[PDB]
Structures are given as structure tokens and as C-alpha cells.
């Protein structure tokens, strides 16, 4: 029927667009000041890229991005949204008296029909770890409406990988799974399921934030150029990595974040979800290693992170990594659609052994 129906189980779509039908979710997204702030600047400050232009807003939700484009002088704006948020955004279009410049089209971008080609596509298709939700494919799919020389806002995406040490996080997994390791839970021996409990917990990417000093080597960046990439490029994403360790210790996994750049004619605006930057609602994503890997400063940690698209609008994660000086290796399989939200609001504590001067001296 449509490209979206082929690659997405109906049940996943239902749950998915039902989520985005709630104004409370839009609200949560709009109240991300970094997110909404950066998108606004990237649009109004590149006003020549919108002034009198034709615009496509893919997955517009409430239409906020389509108003920024209007605020930038766009002539006509086709705002596509599949969730039932489309009708709320039409209301906002009427109430803001923009029915002549912003056209809401209820429906999935892979199925709707636009009356013309656009000069620029705008969207917010980034999920956590960038690739979750598989909306980037819808963003690249939308290029069937983009004229030659048209632009994409965002234009590129940089996903960053880095190995981290966090013993507390790792040990937490066994502390929770060890619930099942008792011979008499109300007179039942649960121990036979302890191993399955561990496995289940390690399959979950961890969504929270952390102090930069848990990282043991500079980041490796894999870049998707939205102006050149095609849908099929994202069904299988292989991210080779060769980290040079700057800190000795136990590598418990790889940390993920991403950035996007709105490369306009006037300036390039960056939206970065890095642990060095103020927190956004994307947080950061860490993938643990079933078995951790000892590494010393000067060793090389090498391997691959392979993401395989599934019919649940997410990715199956496979991470293989070894310390080249020892041959010690570690594998892991995680489901990006079932993360464990760990954030607690507390500022991330610094890893131990990080004071190189007496804390008492300058207290």
C-alpha cells in the first residue's frame, strides 16, 4: 500500500501515533527550551532560506515549526502530520489567521499528496540515540517533494559514540536481577530465572545523563547527511569504531548522543544533545556490555555498533568490542524500543578517583 505500511506493523503505528495525539506530549516537546529555542533561531536567522519559499513540515505536530517558517516569510507551507494532532494544528492555523500560508495535511508523509514541490523541508525526526522511531526514513522519503538544490532543515546528523566506565550502573543490573536468586520466595525457588533476569536488563539501553568524566576516550562520530542519504541507507547502520583509551579502567559500555546542523545560506545553527550541553528531552543513551572490558590508557578499543531496523519503528542493537592489546572481547544485544529511563533529576555525580588535588585544600 505505502512505504510506511510495509515497514511498520499496524500495532506499532497505533501505539505510536496515539502517543503523539496528546497535547501533553507536544507540550513536553515545546517546553524543551534548547529544542524549540534552537529550531526557532535556525529558521528566523536563516530568513533568506524561507522568505517567499515553499516549505514542507514533516511530522509538524502542533505546527510550531510551520509558524517559525511563516515568521520567516514563507509563501506557502504544507504541514504534514499523521497523528490526530493534525486537527489541533489546523485550529492554531485558523486562530493565528494563517490559513493562506500554512496548509495542514492530515496523514503520513508517505501517503499524502502535495500540489507542488518545495524549496526546503523542515522536520524534527530525531529520536533518542537519533535513530529511534525510524522517522529519519520518513524525513528522507519526503525528498520526493524537494526541488533540486532544495535544502533540508536539519541538514545533517552526527551521532557520537564513546566508551564509559560506570561500575554503579553495571552492578545495578545484577542487584535487580538478584531478586530471583532466593531458594524460598514465599516457599518458591526463583533462582532458575536469575540468568533470564540479567539478560532482560542488559537488553535495555539506559536513558539518562552522566558526568563527562565517565568517558574514557574521545568520541567517534558517524554522520548522516540528510541531503544525500536515502531511506534504505538507514535499514542497516554499521558504525565502526576504534577508540584510543585515555583512561585506564573497566569499560562497561558505549555512550551515545547526537547533534544536528541547520546549514542555512546565512549561517549554520547547531542543535547538540551532548553531555557537555544543557539537557534536552533526548537526554543521552548508554549501552552496557554484558561483560566489561579492562583497558589501560594507551590501549585501543575497537569494534562495531550495528543497528538493524525492525518493524517496531526502532532498531535492534548489536555491539561487539575488544581491547586489541589483550584480545578480550565483549558482545551485547539491546532493544532500542524498550529503554530503561533512569534519570532522577539529581545532577550526575563525578566518578570516584577523579580528584587530582586535595578536596580539603580548596574547600
Amino acid at each position: 500500500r505505502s512505504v510506511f505500511s510495509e515497514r511498520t506493523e499496524e500495532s506499532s503505528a497505533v501505539q505510536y501515533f496515539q502517543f503523539y495525539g496528546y497535547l501533553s506530549q507536544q507540550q513536553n516537546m515545546m517546553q524543551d527550551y534548547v529544542r524549540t529555542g534552537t529550531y526557532q533561531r535556525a529558521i528566523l536567522q536563516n530568513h533568506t532560506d524561507f522568505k517567499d519559499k515553499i516549505v514542507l513540515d514533516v511530522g509538524c505536530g502542533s505546527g510550531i515549526l510551520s509558524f517559525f517558517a511563516a515568521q520567516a516569510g514563507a509563501r506557502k507551507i504544507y504541514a504534514v502530520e499523521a497523528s490526530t494532532m493534525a486537527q489541533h494544528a489546523e485550529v492554531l492555523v485558523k486562530s493565528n489567521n494563517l490559513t493562506d500560508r500554512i496548509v495542514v495535511i492530515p496523514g503520513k508523509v508517505e501517503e499524502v499528496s502535495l500540489p507542488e514541490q518545495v524549496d526546503i523541508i523542515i522536520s524534527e525526526p530525531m529520536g533518542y540515540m537519533l535513530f529511534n522511531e525510524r522517522m529519519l526514513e520518513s524525513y528522507l522519503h519526503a525528498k520526493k517533494y524537494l526541488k533540486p538544490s532544495g535544502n533540508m532543515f536539519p541538514t545533517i546528523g552526527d551521532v557520537h559514540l564513546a566508551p564509559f566506565t560506570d561500575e554503579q550502573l553495571y552492578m545495578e543490573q545484577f542487584t535487580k536481577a538478584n531478586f530471583w536468586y532466593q531458594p524460598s520466595f514465599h516457599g518458591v525457588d526463583l533462582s532458575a530465572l536469575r540468568g533470564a533476569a540479567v539478560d532482560e536488563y542488559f537488553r535495555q539501553p539506559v536513558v539518562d545523563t552522566f558526568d563527562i568524566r565517565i568517558l574514557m576516550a574521545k568520541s567517534v562520530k558517524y554522520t548522516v547527511n540528510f541531503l544525500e542519504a536515502k531511506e534504505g541507507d538507514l535499514h542497516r547502520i554499521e558504525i565502526p569504531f576504534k577508540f584510543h583509551m585515555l583512561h585506564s579502567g573497566l569499560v562497561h559500555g558505549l555512550a551515545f548522543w547526537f547533534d544536528v546542523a541547520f546549514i542555512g545560506s546565512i549561517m549554520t545553527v547547531w542543535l547538540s544533545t551532548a553531555p557537555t550541553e544543557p539537557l534536552t528531552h533526548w537526554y543521552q543513551v548508554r549501552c552496557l556490555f554484558q561483560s566489561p572490558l579492562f583497558a589501560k590508557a594507551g590501549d585501543t578499543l575497537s569494534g562495531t555498533c550495528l543497528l538493524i531496523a525492525n518493524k517496531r519503528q526502532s532498531y535492534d542493537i548489536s555491539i561487539v568490542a575488544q581491547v586489541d592489546q589483550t584480545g578480550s572481547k565483549s558482545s551485547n544485544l539491546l532493544d532500542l524500543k524498550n529503554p530503561f529511563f533512569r534519570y532522577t533529576g539529581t545532577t550526575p555525580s563525578p566518578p570516584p578517583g577523579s580528584h587530582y588535588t586535595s578536596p580539603s585544600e580548596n574547600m
Binding site: 501505539q15 505510536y16 502517543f19 503523539y20 506530549q25 513536553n28 516537546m29 517546553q31 524543551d32 529520536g127 533518542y128 529511534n132 522511531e133 536513558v207 539537557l279 534536552t280 528531552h281 533526548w282 537526554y283 517496531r312 526502532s314 532500542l336 524500543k337 524498550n338 529503554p339 529511563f341 534519570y343 533529576g345
Partner: peptide
């Protein structure tokens, strides 16, 4: 997933 976009505290 269940919550594609995570809640960010205001």
C-alpha cells in the same frame, strides 16, 4: 516504544 519522547522536567 512506549514513550518515543521522554519527559523533560520543567
Amino acid at each position: 516504544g512506549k514513550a518515543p519522547r521522554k519527559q523533560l522536567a520543567t
